[PDB]
Amino acid sequence: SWTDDLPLCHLSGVGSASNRSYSADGKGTESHPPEDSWLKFRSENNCFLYGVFNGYDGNRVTNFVAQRLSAELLLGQLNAEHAEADVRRVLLQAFDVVERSFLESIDDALAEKASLQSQLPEGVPQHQLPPQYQKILERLKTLEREISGGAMAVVAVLLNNKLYVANVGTNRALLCKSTVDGLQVTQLNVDHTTENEDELFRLSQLGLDAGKIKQVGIICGQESTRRIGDYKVKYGYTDIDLLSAAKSKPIIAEPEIHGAQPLDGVTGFLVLMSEGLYKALEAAHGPGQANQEIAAMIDTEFAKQTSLDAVAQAVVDRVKRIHSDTFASGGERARFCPRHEDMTLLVRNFGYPLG
């Protein structure tokens, strides 16, 4: 709540939308609690900090990642004067701390879990388990809710018209410069997926069957090879099939910082988006060529709207309608768009004309 006190960024806007599971019934959409989250703060130093997070297994970690990353970057940890390698250190530490402190938070609760499972008979139905054991089972679920969760992240720091982008998964971060030729969409981050050869290298260097991983694509329902939290994959990776034989942690929370961009005399806008957004547009429009469309869509709405929040929200709502139309149209991509995931879109304006 100390984050509430921080001054907010007049030059940034956000648009978001909850997961929807289109019912075949027709005209009906079920939704679980949203797990994405974001972050748009200006410090005293004119050090701007943006972030879009992508939770799963609940939004506990999302909120922790945000609240803590704020404390590790917006209390003077970043200064104007810092050199490029100077800042790239402060980020690496901030993210390290976050991952260390998260796992430390749940240690007490994880130990309690171990104890209460020791009290419970192995390989047994819950409804068939006598009333005696019901109190334990509730507490194990209470605990589970508390410790469970993970989060992909993508964070951008603006410091003296230098843009640094720390990324920990599938969340994307396009820089959109409007040159004379057109709008130059250029993705600053890199998708840490099971198809990133560079990540397949790091996974191979842990003695993993990179071909099998590459084949399946998903790892416990996620395709992200880097995540913050999720004790399941940070601790019990030995119990996962694909990760059975890893020298050290297969899923890691080390950010891939990306070099400074000179935003001196640049006109354009920055796009931090979640996985859910672009993943949904591809699901309806066909693979690849997605970053492009959204960057444009924002470009369109940039003149059509009166606020960056509306500009972002405009676009998210189109992607939603595209996906929904594509389901109800009954076309060839209707099987591709039965549902979608929490969408988030943050837009930092670099002078680009609004309204």
Swiss-Prot record:
- Give every PPM-type phosphatase domain span: 13-350
Name a single GO biological process.
non-canonical NF-kappaB signal transduction
Signal peptide range:
none
Post-translational note = These phosphorylations inhibit TAK1 activation by a feedback control mechanism. Ubiquitinated by MAP3K1 with 'Lys-63'-linked polyubiquitin; leading to activation of TAK1 and of JNK and p38 MAP kinases following EGF and TGF-beta stimulation. Ubiquitinated by ITCH with 'Lys-48'-linked polyubiquitin; leading to proteasomal degradation. Ubiquitinated by RNF114 during maternal-to-zygotic transition; leading to degradation.
Q: What is its main location?
A: cytoplasm
The subcellular localization recorded is: Cytoplasm, Cytosol; Endoplasmic reticulum membrane
Entry keyword Zinc? no
Top-rank taxon: Eukaryota
Topology relative to the membrane, per the entry?
A: Peripheral membrane protein
Cellular component annotations (GO), alphabetically ordered: cytoplasm; cytosol; endoplasmic reticulum; endoplasmic reticulum membrane; endosome membrane; protein-containing complex
One annotated GO molecular function is: protein serine/threonine phosphatase activity
Q: How does it assemble?
A: Interacts with XIAP and BIRC7. Interacts with TRAF6 and MAP3K7; during IL-1 signaling. Identified in the TRIKA2 complex composed of MAP3K7, TAB1 and TAB2. Interacts with TRAF6 and MAPK14; these interactions allow MAPK14 autophosphorylation. Interacts with STING1; interaction takes place following cGAMP activation and promotes TAB1 recruitment to the endoplasmic reticulum, triggering MAP3K7/TAK1 activation and STING1 phosphorylation.
The function of this protein is: Key adapter protein that plays an essential role in JNK and NF-kappa-B activation and proinflammatory cytokines production in response to stimulation with TLRs and cytokines. Mechanistically, associates with the catalytic domain of MAP3K7/TAK1 to trigger MAP3K7/TAK1 autophosphorylation leading to its full activation. Similarly, associates with MAPK14 and triggers its autophosphorylation and subsequent activation. In turn, MAPK14 phosphorylates TAB1 and inhibits MAP3K7/TAK1 activation in a feedback control mechanism.
What protein does this entry describe?
TGF-beta-activated kinase 1 and MAP3K7-binding protein 1
Q: Which organism is it from?
A: Homo sapiens (Human)
Q: Please name the gene that encodes this protein.
A: TAB1
Q: Which residues of the full protein are shown?
A: 16 to 370 of 504
